[PDB]
Design a protein around this ligand. Sequence first.
Ligand SMILES: Nc1ncnc2c1ncn2[C@@H]1O[C@H](COP(=O)(O)OP(=O)(O)OP(=O)(O)O)[C@@H](O)[C@H]1O
Ligand SMILES: [Ca+2]
Ligand SMILES: [Mg+2]
Lengths: 319, 93, 167
Amino acid sequence: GPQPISRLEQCGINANDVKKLEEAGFHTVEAVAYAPKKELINIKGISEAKADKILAEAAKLVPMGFTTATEFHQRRSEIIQITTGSKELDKLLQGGIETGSITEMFGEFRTGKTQICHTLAVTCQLPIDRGGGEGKAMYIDTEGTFRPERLLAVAERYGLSGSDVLDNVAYARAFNTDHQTQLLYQASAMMVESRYALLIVDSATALYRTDYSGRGELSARQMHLARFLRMLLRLADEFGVAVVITNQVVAQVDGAAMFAADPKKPIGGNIIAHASTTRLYLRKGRGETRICKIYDSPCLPEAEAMFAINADGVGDAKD
Amino acid sequence: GPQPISRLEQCGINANDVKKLEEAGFHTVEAVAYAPKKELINIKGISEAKADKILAEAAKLVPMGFTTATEFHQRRSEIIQITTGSKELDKLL
Amino acid sequence: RFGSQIFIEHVADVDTLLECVNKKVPVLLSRGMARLVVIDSVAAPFRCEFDSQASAPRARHLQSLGATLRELSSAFQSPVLCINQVTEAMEEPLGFWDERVSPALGITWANQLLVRLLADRLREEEAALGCPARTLRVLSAPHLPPSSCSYTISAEGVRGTPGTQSH
DNA sequence: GAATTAACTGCCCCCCCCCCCCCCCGTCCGACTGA
DNA sequence: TCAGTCGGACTAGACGGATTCGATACAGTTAATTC
DNA sequence: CCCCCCCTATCGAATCCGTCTACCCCCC
Ligand SMILES: Nc1ncnc2c1ncn2[C@@H]1O[C@H](COP(=O)(O)OP(=O)(O)OP(=O)(O)O)[C@@H](O)[C@H]1O
Ligand SMILES: [Ca+2]
Ligand SMILES: [Mg+2]
C-alpha cells in the first residue's frame, strides 16, 4: 500500500535528511506529504528550504488534488468489513466494522467491550470470503485485562489453529498517557514492515481519568487527547486499517428529573465526540444477553440489535 | 522481584537525586519507569532535562515495548492463585 | 428619495481603503452629495495583515487614516461614524477593569476618537427571559457622563426602551 | 579544604449570587391494532 | 389466530458544587570541578 | 565626505461526579 520513505532520496534528497525524518516518526511518503510544514520545521537538521523541497517532492509523488465523486464512489466500494461474530450486529452495521475510520464503543461495566475486542482480534485473520480481513491484529492494553484464553476459545469456535492465532497478535501495555502516545511510532514501524488490519486501544481514555484530576487540568488533558486522536486518524488514513477504541461513562448528577432513572454519558467530551466516526452504545439485557445501539454514524440509521456473550465469545443470542 | 532504585547510581544519577526520589515515594526502577514525566517534574529540585535523563535511564532497564501474545500467554500460565479455604469458591474462581 | 441618496463602496485591503478615503470620499463630500461617512468595519482590514510583531506599521497606518478622516470631517462639517469589533480581556489600565471585552486596535486608534460608544448583548444565560437583552452604553465623551439604556430591534428599525436610562 | 563555575526556581489575589427545565438508559403492562 | 406498538399507573422524591493555561532575564541557593 | 538627533499588544480554551429505605390488616 504505502510507499516507503526510502524512495525520496531517488528524487534528490540526501540520506541524512531521510534518516532524520525516520527518527521523526515518518516512515512512508504519505506520512510526510500529509504533515504540515510546522511539523517538519521542528526537526533539528531541517530548515525551511529543505522542508519546502521535501514537501514539493512528496506532492509530486502523492496525488492530493480534486477528484470526481464517481471515482471516489468506485474506490470506496472495495473496502473491507470485518464480521463481529454476530449476525444481528452484522446486519445492524451493514457488513461489519469498516476500515479506514475510527469506531468507538462505550458503556458501563460488564457490558462486553473487552469480549468484543477479543472477538475482533481473532476474526480479523479470517479470509475475506469468510468476513475477515486477511491480516494481523494489534492490541494496546491500558488496564491489564488481556486474556489469550478468550482468543483460544474463539479460534476453536472458528476452526483455526490456536498457536497460529496467538502468533499473529501484537500486545503492548501502557502505564501512562505519555507512554500510551509513545507506542504509536513503533506501531507505524511494524505496520510499514508487515501488513496489519486492526488496531485495538482499550481503554483509550482510562488513564486520562487519573493523570489529570481537577478542572485545572482539563485543557491539557483535552489537548493531549486531541493529539492522540489525530495520530490515530493519520495512522488509519496512511495504512488503511480499522481503528477500534473503547470508552467509559460518567453519571449525570444534576439529573434534571428525566425518565432514564440512571442517566450516564461517555467521557472525553466534544473532542472525542467530533473525532469518532462511528459510536456504539452497549448495555445489559437479561442473563447474558446485551443490547447494542447505533449512537452516531454518517450512513447508518439509528437502530438497535441484541447479541450475547457465550463461552465461545461474542455471538448471537442463543435460545 | 523488582530491582531497587539504588541501581540508578551506576547509570549516572546523582546520589541526592536518588535520595529525593526515594523520599518522594519511589523505591524501585519499575516505579520510576511507570511514573509520568509531569509527576517527576512535581518534585522540588528536579528539572525537565534531569527528569528526561532519569526516565531514559530507567526505561533502558525495564522492557516497555511490543511482544507477541504467545509470550504473554506463556508468562500468564505461571501465575499464583491463592485458595479461599472452600472447595466451592475455588472451583467457581 | 431614500434610495438615490446613498452611495456604496467596497474595499478588500488596507491600502485599498487608504486610497478610497484619500481619493473618492473628498470628491463626494466637496460636491455636496453626502454629508455623512460610515465605515462598516475599520478593524477588519487591519486584523488580516499585521501580527503581534508588526505594531509600528499598523500604528502608522492608523494614525494616517485618523488624521485624514478628522481633516475631512472638520473641513466639510460631516460626522464620521466608525464601526469597530472587540477582543476579550483574557484576564491575567485603559479603564476596563471588570469588562469581559474591550475595543480592538489598541490605544493608538483610541487616541483618534471623540465619542466612544459600545453596544452589548447579554446571551441566553442572562437572556433566558424570552427575548434578547440589548444595552447601548456610553464609554467616554468630552461632554457626556457615562450612561446606558436599552433598545430592541424590530421590523421598523432600532428603538430605545423608554424609562431605562441609567444615571 | 576551598576558590570557582554551573544548574533549578521564582516574580500573588478576584469571582459570595441561586428559575430554567431538552430530548431517554424509563420497567413494564393493558389494550389497540392490523394482519 | 398473534405479536408489534400507543399510551401510560405503577405506594412514596428530594439533594450542589468544583480552576488553570503565555510568550520571558537576573539574582538566590545548592551542587559539581580542579588546585 | 564631515556634524545630531528617534517606535509599539495580541489573541480564547475546556467538562466532571452519584446518595439515600419506609410501612400492617383482617373473622367464621
Ligand atoms: N468464559 C466466559 N463465558 C461467559 N461469559 C463470560 C466469560 N468470560 C467473561 N464473561 C462475561 O463477561 C462479562 C464482562 O465483560 P467484559 O470483560 O468485556 O467487560 P467490560 O465492559 O470490558 O468491563 P470494564 O468496564 O470493567 O472494562 C461478565 O459479566 C461475564 O458474564
Ligand atoms: Ca462523530
Ligand atoms: Mg474492559
